[PDB]
Structure formats: structure tokens, C-alpha cells
Design a protein around this nucleic acid. Structure first.
Lengths: 317, 323, 317, 323
DNA sequence: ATAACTTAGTATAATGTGCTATACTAAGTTAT
DNA sequence: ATAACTTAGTATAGCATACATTATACTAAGTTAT
DNA sequence: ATAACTTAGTATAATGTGCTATACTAAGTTAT
DNA sequence: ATAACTTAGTATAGCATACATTATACTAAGTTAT
């Protein structure tokens, strides 16, 4: 117990060893779990395997996604493991129930959704329309969409970029230095090459916004109603805003979205990653070159982002 | 504690849906076997002792069983103990040692793994030619089945689950069958298979002589009784035995007697057709984007095993030597 | 001790879990070690780290190769580890001395040798000469050399082949089914494709030797002075003989070997593996295709087997 | 036990040749540092306590030190304890946690890793043009040094070790320098570098004005005193400082003042020339068989970092966008 | 008054051998 | 009687979910320079 | 008598982060 | 006195040896069908 109160103290003292989203979700789950315990007269910690099992079945009955239920189990599992206690998943009740929840939800259909693709055709149509705008917002939004599709960087990676991270190929092409990603942390990092067209788009944004004033300013910043940019070296444009661009841009071409309320009806922060990976495959790009582009290190995310007659052909004659 | 183990067996039963029916079928099968040898040999079957599982594994080896089967037995026993709270036998030296020896002792004697009497175009063309004219409601149906099997490359448990409306003309005065073939999360939902003015039209006949989706619960294929009469079924699945048998009865119509010795794969099986489309998809010049996609194969290890003996797969050396 | 006498008994009872060469070398090292202990009044088991250190330095002083000294340490290490005792290498005296022996021997030059290459040019010259022989030995030896270079199989893999392992590509090419290798054990295994020329060579050997009499006969067998083959389904041609072929064949074209006595003066069992890997690289064959050919799973053995001005070029103008 | 640890420090010293002089130099350096902070902070430096190494690592981070340097300190301390029999600090939670945070906290502030002010053809052509005419025994020598550096792509510690007879004409009225560049087992022994009627001939001048292998113990390069006089040395090595300085003094002759701020790589360094041949070997159209071979690079990770900002390395996307 | 955010919380995706399916033997089940 | 299946049990061949995070997606409400 | 092995033993190769090098600052060493 | 090095100490960037086998290489001596 004392050795457990110290272990949890050592974790919270060196919080920053983990992503801010990890704490955010760890706290969210503990909240949810603790609330469930209270309502049922149960001790939230250490967690009892039978209680954890009931909570998972409870989340399932709530109609939550399998990945969501796995997130809860995972947060509780880390809380315990890092406390020095056994994980709920080290018990059969929990292990087996997780599988069963997976098996049942899937055998009933449920499938992990992936963002609506934002491909070359989409980028060209969008560019064809926005290119002519002198609005600062439009200029910004077009430069963002170009980098997104070109680089495949995640919205969080994009919002991080600083004016000082941009270099130049002799050929005139823009080069973006990326430090940390979701699958990488290092003083090394990657250099992102921008096409001449995309470089143009970005250069135009730099000029109108006046971000290059100070190289420590984030490349992307807000643009108020009066069309005046608002550069900053301490605050980034929220990823929530980076998402709005995608949603706004889709509303521009396709109008307002379904009343269903279901996820993925318009483009989102990940649309360009998915779309470019797909475009790359369709062009015969080497899976290995595709991975370099996406920065992945494996072959399944890549592999997955696609799929779709050939076999007809032969018999067809 | 027997309470700790007993609570573990209760966890297992309570959440048995955590595993497949097949997995349970195999787990019981192995236990029935393990339990049967222990008694005969006067051993306690649970918990399983290392010198016992070892002795048992030597029994299976001397039973002339495959290494992948001996692995299956050890697996179920390991699975049984892992979910019981008892130590897994493979976590034992004696057991760990014996498996390493059996593995090697076996390949060193000629343990060959069976693939599949491929069912290629030569085969479809020949069967088609033999039954195309028959008015037999059965030949008509089995021609469509073999028809899709090739063109479509789907599984056996997946051509059964198929229903009727999953077929449109949209393709354009031609057929497209709509499907479902996954079971993951990130995985998938469905696909859109098409057919020549063979696989699609051959089916038509089935459609004409079987009933059709009078009630689309109606699975595509159904039984055809001795009276050459179908039993369109909106709710029942054609067994995988029946479906596999079409591949077997068909090879018997042709070569007959099914072939002797006592061995595996003497005729065509459920997978025969997929192997045939692959080896064929290999000779025509087919990219892996294409080969993998067609058979819904997540990997390349399996496909290649299928086209292994293909002049098109000879290797760099043969290429260098033949400059 | 009792738990140690049982562990060693369990190892010797399931000996066959290990290669015959592993026992052979385990016994050879124990022999060497025990002899050294006796001569010095030391207990050979369990081994004392300081004694092991002295033995290693003793082997080094004997002028043995670094890999040889590592073999001794490795056998002793397995003997202990598998007995349930701590490995000599788990002690600093032994760990550090091994490194130091490595460092010192190398810093003085010593380099791991690799077999003399038997390449396409060598195969063509040899074939050009032997092709015309009606001798059974020559016919056998030429077929062996062709398979060796074509398949890259190790001599042990070659001596294992059985008549029943040979198939046929529709195109007429010979196919050899390989089960176990040094890096593989499985009911699966590989199929080795023979070129039309090589297939021809093999077919000619099959015809004259009369090996195909019984498909369980090893493809390769002895051929006595009177030129009469001697097929068998229980005995293989010794790898020592497979080596003699390479040595004989080299003596045929280059004559008798240096009086130095040094290893690798003529071709050996591994010459064709090295030579074909090299030939494949020189032809621009994909490292990945090269690995498939050699059956490797890594990229260093492959990588190593080669190396050898380009960089001059540019400046050169 | 202090006897167990003391026996461990004796094992360490007795077989100190198990490590490089550099490794020991770094191990002492870290200890001198760790020992100095502990005292100042009233901590016991050995054995090292987790909350202490953690505090220490926060000191280095706030010292504005690189993450690869903070890693070096933890490494030596781990190495010291591992070979002492005491538990390694990184095997501690507090220590393990702090490193994970520092790593991330640092990249999140702009921890950039330095590469090398490349020394390409533009550079050789310019230096050559500036010194080609000089009669200075020093310019003559440093032109040959920079000459090979580029053409040859060898290390700094490897152009020094070179001696005289490792140079023939065989190439054909041209030069070839014979070398040695490994230190493994399976690795290698030597190589055979050549040069244009520049790198080889530029050297000639050095050969003419320095002495030559009057005694082939004679390393190729040697000091040239203030009197512009050489000191051909069969036994002494030109220090790596001197060799590196030629790259530095040369950049100063050109841009002078060496460049201010306080930072790393403001001029050319020992590796400058290799990076230049690579980026250059990249623009001419060079295969990796060729690029790796030239710099004796066992891997591709390092080389690519060198040509990263090359239009030739832009990527598939830029290629697709520019169709 | 607002555009155009930002903040904040819950929901869900994405990434750096052991389980499940088929093969084959046989015996059971229905309806012709 | 059997054809034509189904069910069952075991051999054997092919597949992919569980770890430990770290990030995106979406809803909702708060904020500030016009 | 032998060719052409095989057997047998020792020697050595081959395969399915932590150590070592450079960079840079400075202070020391010799000979002009 | 300084130019031209060397040595030293620490920061930082790039490399590859240690595990656990399993096999080949070489020397030597024994074996058997001619």
C-alpha cells in the first residue's frame, strides 16, 4: 500500500514522460470507473476483477465501441501496472470478458471506422475554387490542405510546425522539419518536401499572414473576421480548428452534413493521410515508399487504409 | 487451491463465448484424448504433469500424427492450464525438450505438409464441358457453385452464407454478387464480386431451376433431393460438407474411385478452387495487389506456397543461368 | 545438485532436440576443458569463472581463432545454463576476458575467413571440361556442382535430398523439395528450381547411376573405382566427400595447393553459396531476391559475402 | 558485499583492455562529473541512488545539455554499476521515468541534432583554385589532404594511419592508394582507393615537397613547421586535431572568423568531406551499392540523413503532385 | 453581435504462437 | 432401400487479437477582437 | 593394391542500447 | 614570441559485438569392392 502510494506519486511527479492525451484519458476513465463504482457501492481502487468485468459489460450495454471499451480497460490496466499492482487483465474474468465483448460486437457487425478520404481530385477541386480568393482565411486554409495532403502529417504535427522549421531545396521546393510525431520522439526527425505548387500555396500564406516576422512563430495561426492574421510563438492553432478547416472545406463543395449524427460524414483531421496513402497505392507507389511518406514503420495501417474485377479478366475472354 | 482453479473453470464457462465453437470443439477433443490415454496409462489428467504430457506427446508421435497436430494437443493442454491457473506444460523443460526433438525427428523422416489438388481452368473447362448440357437440377447447381468458386475465390463457409439479393445486373447486362468476408475491427464489411458470361449466367440456370430469392432470406445454394428437386431455404445453410462434397463428387465423376492409399488430398477439396485461381492468376501475369486481393489473403506467405512449382516462380539463379 | 543432476539427465534424454553437431562440439569442448582442469588441479564442473577465464586466455595463447574461443565459452555456457546453473559468462571475469580476447586478436589483424568463391565463370569452365566425360564420377560431380551453384544449398542439405524430393515445372525445369536446413526445420520447407542446363546435368546423373530405382534413395551416392554407382536409401554421401568434389575440381583446373596449409586455398563445401550470392549481386539482383535464393532471413551474411573506383568518376572528368 | 563489489572493480581493471581508450575516457569523465555534483549536493556517488541520478539528470537537462549527452551520462553510470554488481539506475522507476520525460520535454523545445557543414565539389573546386599556385609547403600538403578527403571518403582517424607505400601507379599512369578500414571478424582487412589527375597528382606535390616514403614507416601526412619545413615521420601520427584543423583553418581562410554564436558546426569538420561526396554522389545519380560502398557505411540510415534536403530525395508525394 | 476561435470532456481510431478454420471419416436423418 | 444431405469427432492448415500508449473525432460551451 | 570413400576429432564459420568515435574548448609543448 | 602542432577534457554523433546454437573445414585414420 505504502509502496503503492509512492509508485503512483512517482508517476504523477514525472507525468510529462507521457503524452498530455494519456493523462487526459487516464483521468477520464478513472472518472467513469469511479462514478460506476460509487453508484454500485464498490471500491474503485484497487479494482476487483469481477467489478471491472461488470463495468466493461456495462460499457458494452451502453453501446460503446470496442476500441472505447478497450481504452477503459487499458487505462485501468496502466493505473494498476504502474502502481505496482496486478492488472485487471491479469485475471480471467477480465481477459475473457474483453474477448467476448470484442467477439460479440463484431459478430454483430460493428467495425472500426476510418476517416473520409481527401484525395488528389478533392485537392484539385478545392484548389480550383479557393485559389482565386484573396481572403486570408482561404489562403491559409488552402496552404494547410496542401501541406496536409503533400506531407500526410497529422493535424497535431501540423499545428506544431514553426516558421524556423522550413528550409529550401536548391530546386526551390519547401522543406519542413518535423521533430516529434505520434510514433516518434527525437532530435533527429524528418524533413518534409513540398511540391512546387504546394510551396507556392504556403509562400502566399506566409506573405499575407506575416508569420515569418519571427521564425519561432507557428506557421499556422488564427485569422479573425476582419481578415487579420494573429501570429504567435507561444500558442498554436487548435487541432479542433485544423479539423474545422476540413469540415468547412467539405461543406463548401458538398453542403451541410447528414442529420444522422454519425462520424465521418465530412472530411476530418485524418482525411488527407488516408487519401494520399490511397492515391499513392493507386499510382503503383512502393508500399515501402508509401511508408516513408506516412512515416509509419509497419505495414498494416498502410495496408488497411485501402482495399476496395481483376480475377474476372481471364475467364472473361 | 482447488477453489482458485474452480473459480477459474467458472470464469471459463461464464465467458465461453470468448472463443469459437471450433476452438471449444478442439479443446474438448484434445481433453477427451488426453484423458483417455492417462486412464489407460494410469496417470492423472488434471493437473497435467510434465513427464506425463511428454510421454503423451511421444504417443502421438508414434501414433504417426503430424507435428502440427501434436502442436494442437499441447496447445489445448496449455490453454486449459493457462485459464485454470495451473502452470502450462510447455512451460516445462521435459515437455519443452520433447517438442523440440519431435519437431526435428519428424522433418528428418519426411513430414510433408499437404496443400491442395488445385482446381484450375483446365478443370473448370472440363467440368463445364461435361455438365453444360445436363438438365439435372443437381448438375446445374454444382456447375454454378464450381462456377463462382473459381471466378470468385471465396471460402467454403462464405459461398454458403451468401443469400440471393446480393446479386445485381448493374455490372451491365452481366452479374455482380455482393458479399461480406471479414471479422476484425479495422478490417472490413463487404466486397463486390463479378463473373463472366459463365459464372454469372451458369448461376442464372440455378436461379431458373432452383426457385430464386422468392424470399431473400433464401441462401443462394440449397439442397436438391433425390427427385432432382430443390428446397430453397431462406433460413438454412448448405452444410460445408455438402459444399466440399461438390468438389469431391465432381472429381469422382471424372477420375472416379476418389484415389487410394489412405492419405490426405486425393481429390478436390473446399480450397482446391482458390489454389487454382491463384496459380492461374500467376501464369497470366498477375501482380500481388491483384493476387492477395482476389483471395482476401492478408499475407504473401500462403499465396506463394500455392504457386511454388510455377516456372514463373523459378528464381533469380535459374534466370542468371539461362541469361 | 540433485536438481542439477536431473536437469543434465533431462538434456541427455532428449538429446535429439539438438543437432548432432551441437553434441559433438559440446563433448569436444568439455573434453578440452576437463583436460585443462586436470592438468591444473581444477574442478571442471561446476566451472569457476576464474578458471574459465584462465582457460580462454590459454586457448588464445594456443593461437586459436576468436570464433573457436567463443565456441568453447558457448559450450560451457550452455552446459551450465541447461544444468540450471549460472553461466560462466554471467561473471565479469569471463565476460570481460572474452571481449578483451576479441579486441586484442582483431586489433592484431585476425579476421574470420570465408570460402573461396565458386562462380558462374568457374562453373562454365568446369562444365566446359567435364561435360565431355562419360565417367560416372565426373557426371555425378558435375551434377552436384550445378545444383550447388544453382540452389546454393549447403553440402548437408544436398546430401539429404532424396530421389522422391524432385518434382517438375511444366516447363521441364527440375524442382527440389528441401525440408530442413541450418536456419529452418519444418514440414513446409522450400522448393529449389533447377535451370534447364542444370536439370540436364542432373538427369544425366540419374540415368547413369540408377538412383531413381527407388525414390527413397539419396540423389547423390558414392561411385567406386570401377565406375559403378552404389545407391542407398539409408546412407548419404558424406559431406566430407561433397567437399572433396570441390577440392578435386579445383585441383583439376589449378593443380595442387599451397604448402602453407592455410584454409581456403581451394574450393570448399561453401564456395558455391558465396559465389552465387556474389554473382547475383553483380547482376543487380535484389538483395531481397538474393535472400530468397540463399534461404537466409536476415541481411548480413548476404551483405557480408561480397564487398570488393566509382567515386572517382565525377571528379575524373 | 563490499568484497563482491571490490572483486568486481578488480575484474574491471584487470581486463580493462576489454574497452576502448575512448570508452574509458568517457567513463571517467562522467564519474568525475557525477562525483562532482554529488559532493556539491551532498550525495553519495557510489552506489548511485535513484532519486540522486534523477536529480542529476535534471541538472544536466537544465545545464542545457543534449539528450544524447544526458544519455551518455546515464549510460556510463549504468555501465559502472552493471560491472560493479550493483543495480543499474536506469533499472529504477524514478530514473526510468525522468529520462522518458526529458527526452520528450527536449524535442518539444527544439532539440536539433547537428550534421555537418558539407564539403562538396563547389568547395574543393574553390579551395583548389585558391591554393593550386601557392608554393607554401603547407598549402601543398593541405590541398592533397582535402584532395583525398573528398575523392576517398575515408575517416579522419584513417587518413592519418595511412603510410607511404600504400600508393602505386598500377592504376595506369595514375594513383591508387591501398588502405585498411575495419575492426570486426567477419568484417574486412583492406580496400583500394583511386584518384583523378587531381587527388593523386595533388598528392605528388606533397610527395615532392615533404620527403616521401624515404622510410615507409613514414605516414603519408606529417607536420610542417613554421619554417614551411616538413618532418616526415615513419612512427608518429598526425593528430586528429591537426587533420580536423585543416578543414577548419581552410574554412577560416575563406569565410574567416570561423562564425559566432557559441554553437556546433560553424565551419568544416573532419566529416564535412564525406557528407559532401555523398550529397554529390546523390546528385550525379548514384546507386546505394555505390553510396554505401564509398563511405564504408554498413547502413542506409546515416547516409540518407546526409542527402535529406536534396531535390532528388523529395519523395513520392511531390512526384505525384507534379505529375 | 459575431466570426472564428479555444477549452474541455467523452468517444474512438492508430501505432511503435494461440486461436479458428478446413479436411476428412463416419455415422445419423429425411424424404423420395 | 438410397440419395443427399447433417452432424460429429479428430486431423491438420491457415490465420490475427492483446499490450501500452498516443492521437483524432465530435459535442458543447466559453472567449475576444472587432 | 587401391580408389574412393567413411569416421572422427579438433578448428572455425554462419545464422535464426551499449560501446566507440568525432567535435569542439582549451591549455600544453617545440622548434623556429 | 608564435606557428603548428599535441594532449586533455567533455559534448555529441555514429556505429556493431554477445546469445545460443548449427553447420562447415581440415587432418587423419579406418574401410570395402574391386
Amino acid at each position: 500500500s505504502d509502496e503503492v502510494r509512492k509508485n503512483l506519486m512517482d508517476m504523477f511527479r514525472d507525468r510529462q514522460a507521457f503524452s498530455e492525451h494519456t493523462w487526459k484519458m487516464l483521468l477520464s476513465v478513472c472518472r467513469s470507473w469511479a462514478a460506476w463504482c460509487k453508484l454500485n457501492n464498490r471500491k474503485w481502487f484497487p479494482a476487483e476483477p469481477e467489478d471491472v468485468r461488470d463495468y466493461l459489460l456495462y460499457l458494452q450495454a451502453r453501446g460503446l465501441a470496442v476500441k472505447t471499451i478497450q481504452q477503459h480497460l487499458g487505462q485501468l490496466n496502466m493505473l494498476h501496472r504502474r502502481s505496482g499492482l496486478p492488472r485487471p487483465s491479469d485475471s480471467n474474468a477480465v481477459s475473457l470478458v474483453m474477448r467476448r465483448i470484442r467477439k460479440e460486437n463484431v459478430d454483430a457487425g460493428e467495425r472500426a471506422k476510418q476517416a473520409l478520404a481527401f484525395e488528389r481530385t478533392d485537392f484539385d477541386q478545392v484548389r480550383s475554387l479557393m485559389e482565386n480568393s484573396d481572403r486570408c482565411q482561404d489562403i491559409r486554409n488552402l496552404a494547410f490542405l496542401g501541406i496536409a495532403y503533400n506531407t500526410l502529417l497529422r493535424i497535431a504535427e501540423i499545428a506544431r510546425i514553426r516558421v524556423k522549421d522550413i528550409s529550401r531545396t536548391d530546386g526551390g521546393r519547401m522543406l519542413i522539419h518535423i521533430g516529434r510525431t505520434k510514433t516518434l520522439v527525437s532530435t533527429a526527425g524528418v524533413e518534409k518536401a513540398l511540391s512546387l505548387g504546394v510551396t507556392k500555396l504556403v509562400e502566399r500564406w506566409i506573405s499575407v499572414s506575416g508569420v515569418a516576422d519571427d521564425p519561432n512563430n507557428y506557421l499556422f495561426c488564427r485569422v479573425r473576421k476582419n481578415g487579420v492574421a494573429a501570429p504567435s510563438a507561444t500558442s498554436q492553432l487548435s487541432t479542433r480548428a485544423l479539423e474545422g478547416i476540413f469540415e468547412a472545406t467539405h461543406r463548401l463543395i458538398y453542403g451541410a452534413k447528414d442529420d444522422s449524427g454519425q462520424r465521418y460524414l465530412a472530411w476530418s483531421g485524418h482525411s488527407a493521410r488516408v487519401g494520399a496513402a490511397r492515391d499513392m497505392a493507386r499510382a503503383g507507389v512502393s508500399i515501402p515508399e508509401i511508408m516513408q511518406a506516412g512515416g509509419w514503420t509497419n505495414v498494416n495501417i498502410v495496408m488497411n487504409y485501402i482495399r476496395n474485377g481483376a480475377m474476372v479478366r481471364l475467364l472473361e475472354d
